[PDB]
Every structure is written in structure tokens, then in C-alpha cells.
Design a protein around this ligand. Sequence first.
Ligand SMILES: [Cl-]
Length: 223
Amino acid sequence: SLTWHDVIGNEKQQAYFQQTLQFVESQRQAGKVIYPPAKDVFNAFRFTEFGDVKVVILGQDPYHGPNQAHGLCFSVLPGVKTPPSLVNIYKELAQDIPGFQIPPHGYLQSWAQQGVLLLNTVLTVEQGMAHSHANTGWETFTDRVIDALNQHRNGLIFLLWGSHAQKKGQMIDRQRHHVLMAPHPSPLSAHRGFLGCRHFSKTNQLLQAQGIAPINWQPELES
Ligand SMILES: [Cl-]
């Protein structure tokens, strides 16, 4: 029943956090193209409340091209070309989940509505520049996010894809929470151990073992 407000609202008063927001705003004011739009930065928290989190998936940076990032890792809004990482996520789901169909869009917010926290560890990026906002304080913030989930929840499933995400989750209590590892679904590593990981069926097995409803991984468009 605890909310993000309850467990991490205190971050608003932290110097590092205020300095992160001040930096992003100054960059925007200077004419830097920063993604996602300001109104979307915290969408993962909007769409999966703290007490509602069942599954945590980490990304690193928001997508850095136009029309892509909207505040959820890996997702793009309807009408946008499915980026390479999500192409591979979808390929895995098609093999892993009976009856899953690769959708003609990349919008994953229906996963968030079911309790899948779609968290990037860095929450903004300058256009075309990977890792541009890596050392701005966002990693501090998302460290606090992961610590809150680790300490104040039990039985979460963390899907940690790639070395950055796995290092990010190094403090997660692996007895109290269920951590699943695979490489990043980017084409740079998908074919070297992500494809075949079966994380989506495994996640559902673990949820069912707890008496929790499994995720319907088939993404839905707005109605
Ligand atoms: Cl990608």
C-alpha cells in the first residue's frame, strides 16, 4: 500500500536530485534537445506505483532519437518504429510465450499497468548522444529507487539485462527477491544469450508460485 511519495518523496529535498533537475532544465533552456519531454520523465512511477510493482525491468538511457523515449524503458509510443532492442524482446516473447504475436507497435505501457516497472537508470538523454546524462545524478536517484524496492518490498522479480543492469542490482537481496540475468536485448548482445533466456515465462512461473496474477505480455494499444 506504500506509494513512491512515501518511500522516495524525500529525494526531492536532496541536493543531488535538485541539481539533476536544474541541470536538465538549463540544458533545455539552452536549446539542447533532451529526451524524453519533461512531462514524461517520471512516467515509470506514474504508471507503476510502489505497492503495485511486481516485476522490475531496467534499461540504461532513454532512447536518444526523435519520437522515441516516453519515460518507460524499451517502449515507444504507437506509430513509432520498434527499436532494435525491442525487436529482440519481441522475438524472445514469440518463442517463449505460447500464442504471443509480435505486435505492429512498440508501446509497452500495458506491462506497466500490470506491475512491470519500466525503469531506466538514467532518466534523460541529449539527442543522438548515448550516455550523455550518465554522470548527472540520475544514477544516484535510481540507486535510491532500487534500494527502496529491495528494502520495502518482498518477492519482486528483477529482470537484469546486461552488465550495467546487473551491476545496478548488485545489492538486491537474492533470497527475498528473484533476480533473472541475461544479456542486453540490443543487437550488440541479444544473439549471445538473451534470445533463449525465457525470462517472460520464468517471470510468470515465479508470479504464479506466489499466488500473484501472471503478466499478459501481449502489449495493448489504447482503446
Ligand atoms: Cl535499441
